[PDB]
Amino acid sequence: RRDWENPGVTQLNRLAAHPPFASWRNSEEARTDRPSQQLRSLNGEWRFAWFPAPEAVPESWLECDLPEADTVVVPSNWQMHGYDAPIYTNVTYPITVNPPFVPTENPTGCYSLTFNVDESWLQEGQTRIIFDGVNSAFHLWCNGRWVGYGQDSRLPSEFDLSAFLRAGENRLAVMVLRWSDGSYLEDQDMWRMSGIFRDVSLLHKPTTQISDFHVATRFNDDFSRAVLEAEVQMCGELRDYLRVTVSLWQGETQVASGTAPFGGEIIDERGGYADRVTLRLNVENPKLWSAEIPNLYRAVVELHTADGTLIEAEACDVGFREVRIENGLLLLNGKPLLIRGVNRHEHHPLHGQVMDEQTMVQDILLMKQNNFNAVRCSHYPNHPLWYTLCDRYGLYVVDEANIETHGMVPMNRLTDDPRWLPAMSERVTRMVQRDRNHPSVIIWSLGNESGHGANHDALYRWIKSVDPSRPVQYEGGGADTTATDIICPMYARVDEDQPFPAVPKWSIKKWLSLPGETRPLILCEYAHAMGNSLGGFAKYWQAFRQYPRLQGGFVWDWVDQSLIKYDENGNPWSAYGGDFGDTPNDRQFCMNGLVFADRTPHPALTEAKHQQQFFQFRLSGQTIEVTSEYLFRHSDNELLHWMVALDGKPLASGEVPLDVAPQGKQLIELPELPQPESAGQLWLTVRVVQPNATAWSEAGHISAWQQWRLAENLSVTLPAASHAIPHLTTSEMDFCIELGNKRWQFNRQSGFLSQMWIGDKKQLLTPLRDQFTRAPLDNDIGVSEATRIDPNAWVERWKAAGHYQAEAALLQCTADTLADAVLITTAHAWQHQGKTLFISRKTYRIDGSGQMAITVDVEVASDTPHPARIGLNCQLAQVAERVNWLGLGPQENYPDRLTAACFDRWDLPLSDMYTPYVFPSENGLRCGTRELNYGPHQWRGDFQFNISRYSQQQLMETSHRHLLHAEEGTWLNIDGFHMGIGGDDSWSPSVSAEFQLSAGRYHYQLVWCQK
Amino acid sequence: AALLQCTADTLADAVLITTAHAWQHQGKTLFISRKTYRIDGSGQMAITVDVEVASDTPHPARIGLNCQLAQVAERVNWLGLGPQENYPDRLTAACFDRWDLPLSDMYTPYVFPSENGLRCGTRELNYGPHQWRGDFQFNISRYSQQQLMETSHRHLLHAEEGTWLNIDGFHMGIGGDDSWSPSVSAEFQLSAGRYHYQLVWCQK
Ligand SMILES: *[C@H]1O[C@H](CO)[C@H](O)[C@H](O)[C@H]1F
Ligand SMILES: [Mg+2]
Ligand SMILES: [Mg+2]
Ligand code: NA
Ligand code: NA
Ligand code: NA
Ligand code: NA
């Protein structure tokens, strides 16, 4: 049969899909969500063996353990145990495209388990096994006998073992195929793995049972009244004495309850459903569910006899909430949402695609503390617990069918084929069927990157029909097809159009008002967080805030998909595409997260947190206007703290309780602020603090901030004439300057400050030279390989123009003496193949104070690609423990990623000055610095800088962080100007014009000295 | 203007004058100007200017220099945007090239008088035997900003002795989305706080 190469066959003997069951036999257990005895885990220690193909499987296997098998933990991904390689491919299918066939060499994993079944279970009722996630397809046997088959790796496959079990010891044989025709619908850009990766369990149901239940909450115009409607379906023998009781609880308080025997209303000419019943519960002033206040009720569904005897109980958490699109806006409980979302894969650097509750919880808490309110299940139904936690902590969820056919040509090749409708249908239907009772799910998604075909229209229609409670969205085929209630593009830019044929990506602001367009717009993917990215994040936030119809989006993505590997030494390292021998592969493309695989944030996370803030401020004079973007809660666990500093010197602070209603304003008058004895800029900083701990944060959690410049008093004070004057020692090869214990040397061949001495210690390992390039960010690179270039990538443009290859050609080097200083003047040209790219004119003024003032003026040829930077660099001989500076911080920040940073005086261990992106590049810059202190050195001006033990060249030359080696001394990169980092996407130039170094002429001035 | 410093140095091939001034109002330092004048054996005077603008003072209208030339010449020739009046937020129409007009075309006779005649993106300006080089904006006429500012009807203007030259490293947008509320877009406001420019003044 080769059922795995036939889309017409997606399962054999599978039971119908339904919401989470537990078959309690005690209503209070049910009520309380206590553990149910009728439901048990088979997770743990299994027997497993790997074969290169199903045809290599021995018959005996059904019969008895293979001696050679190994004891492994289940659930797991076999690649995570070393049986074969996990493969990292983005678009290109990991197998030959030739549906519905797969390779003859089709890695097969033979799992088996010997376990005990109790007689009680077999005397009566029904016993089924549930495999939450089996990737990609599998055949099942019990005690030697064949039970069934099943496809779709991301939804539960269930089978009736009732007739297969013996009391005592029993044997399960599970033949899992890596590749099946299902794989053609599983082309997500992530690691390609396989096995029994989700729970395995046994559920006992009575013969007469609750086979399905649907919960609906409808409301009146002002939400003061609601009706909970619950449709209940049974299986088993219908009897007049059978009944259903549905009850609702607000905690320990029974809110409502209703009983009725079976038998639905007339549906049509043949009658109604004798085996179903609907209960309707009225609720006055229900407590509404939202991400803001995840108010939940408990619903208990009891199947019993008229005399009070309980057959079984099922139940679920209930959130009263209404989701609907009206007059072009996405409304929740009548209020238009603002989606602060993130896409999230189920990824563990260790466990692979196997998810655990702790990681889930950790993810949710990180999201929430980062001002995230929504998440998209990119790109398939998640492990069942996910929804529960979302229901509980409060996160809006986009539930997505497990359908992605990215690598077909064109993309809709299958989705437009009616012969694929069936397999596709199951992936949609079974999801709705399973998750339709979770309040957290607010939108259904048809899948991802599978073009736009008729199959999508049909399914779009199916959902609308069966679950009018939620909007359906789908980005394929253009983001605004007839199969979507939401314009939900990926990577559409704020102001910039990308008019690709057939599927253009217009500026979001523009998209909304195209002739006849009326839908709301929420990006299904945006601000591609790969490596040093998120440049331009603020531009989106501003726009979302300004246009009602721009209702946010889901950033791409939450966590880097790196996997842990170890070196000889046994030490762990983060791996990516191709690191497992996988090929073809997409290398680092699998790392686009806001946090590293271990959940350590990337610096971009903070930029995301600020921009997603729920309080907005405005300052007028001494008056602060706080505005709340909350729709539902008041600011009841918040205080505003503020503080005034002069140049980092704290001059005054205070707190102020916040008392703003959802969407209201609060003014805060700052008390007269004293006068600073002293030149400089006064800076106001305000943070919103949570005094009390929550379910998602601890007391003192900071949820928002903002800063402003208050008055400024320019300095009009004269240095103060210095006692001594520096001495100029000319020479054939060098201009030397001495001043006390200090010496500066300028190599006349080169035109650069070759060395400096304090006392008898040399200061530099490498001369101080201009720098116009940077170790390329993932955004600079784009898809620019070896096999294939991509001309347009910044990195390509730079390479090609000679940027990395240009060497300095002296044009002038002189020295003069002034009344109180020596003046070194230089001019250099940077050429490539006869083109002068840049010209650097400088002056060094060393005075009686021993301060060297450097003035730089660079000219950039207009027809050369705008440089990554305009600064200087050198290798210092020293290695200090800390870095202290007066500027933007404390975290890494770039020009188009600097809103979250604050201007103040920061001090960190040098290590905190380097950012450990798994794929190395220019990192750790800090902008708007007026003063930098390191070792004996002090630099002052208004520049950007980074400082670490790794040079630009090393960075650019090393593919993996674990391979970096601290160099001798410390590398300092100090820039007058630094180019934006971009990120609207990572595969095309995304650095906005205002952040490009196009001026042609730049001036900067630095003062170097010893403190 | 409050002089903070003024000095003279002798170079290999030149004399260097270094100055610094503080502009204040009611005890407030509004702006700081720091310069060097470098005259070499070639007769070229190179002016380098660095200014600081208090962050809490309103963004200034322009950052430049000005002076009344003794001389009155018939034409003005320049290498930059033109030939007509052009401002920062109103210069797309203008073209960069070599322009040469009668002095008078360098003045815009708006009925209600104001700053006018500016030309941006100039690399070279020649008037009489004078010549200025760099990268700036300038205006030149027989009318001071003060006159312009005190006279409300163009007919009431009177040519002053000599020619007033306004050379700017920087000039604020003129606006106009409306004429009754501030309309200069932020990108056209002189809010950077620190400004630098340099010009070469010489003869020919
Ligand atoms: C949106 O694009 C990103 C690119 O890293 C991923 O491929 C997503 O799965 C896709 F839907
Ligand atoms: Mg099949
Ligand atoms: Mg894809
Ligand atoms: Na909006
Ligand atoms: Na990716
Ligand atoms: Na690199
Ligand atoms: Na006037």
What distinguishing features does this structure have?
part of a larger assembly; 2 chains; 1011 residues; mainly beta; Jelly Rolls; Immunoglobulin-like; TIM Barrel; seven-stranded antiparallel β-sheet; 39% strand; globular; binds 2-deoxy-2-fluoro-beta-D-galactopyranose; binds magnesium ion; binds sodium ion
Topology:
The structure is cut from a larger assembly and holds two copies of chain A.
Chain A: E1 11-12, H1 27-31, E2 39-41, E3 44-51, H2 60-63, E4 70-74, E5 87-89, E6 108-117, H3 119-123, E7 126-131, E8 134-135, E9 137-142, E10 145-151, E11 157-160, E12 168-177, E13 190-192, E14 195-196, E15 200-205, E16 209-219, E17 225-235, E18 242-250, E19 253-260, E20 276-284, E21 297-305, E22 310-318, E23 323-326, E24 329-332, E25 335-336, E26 339-343, H4 357-369, E27 374-376, H5 385-394, E28 396-400, H6 421-435, E29 441-445, H7 454-466, E30 472-473, H8 508-512, E31 521-526, H9 537-546, E32 550-555, E33 563-566, E34 572-575, H10 604-611, E35 615-620, E36 623-628, E37 639-646, E38 649-657, E39 665-669, E40 680-690, E41 701-713, E42 727-729, E43 734-739, E44 742-747, E45 752-758, E46 761-762, E47 764-771, H11 778-781, H12 794-801, E48 807-818, E49 821-832, E50 835-847, E51 852-860, E52 869-876, E53 882-889, E54 902-909, E55 926-934, E56 937-948, H13 952-957, E57 970-978, E58 1001-1010
Helix pairs in contact in A: 4-5, 6-7
The structure holds 2-deoxy-2-fluoro-beta-D-galactopyranose (2FG), magnesium ion (2 copies) and sodium ion (NA) (4 copies).
One magnesium ion binds near residues 4 and 9 of chain A.
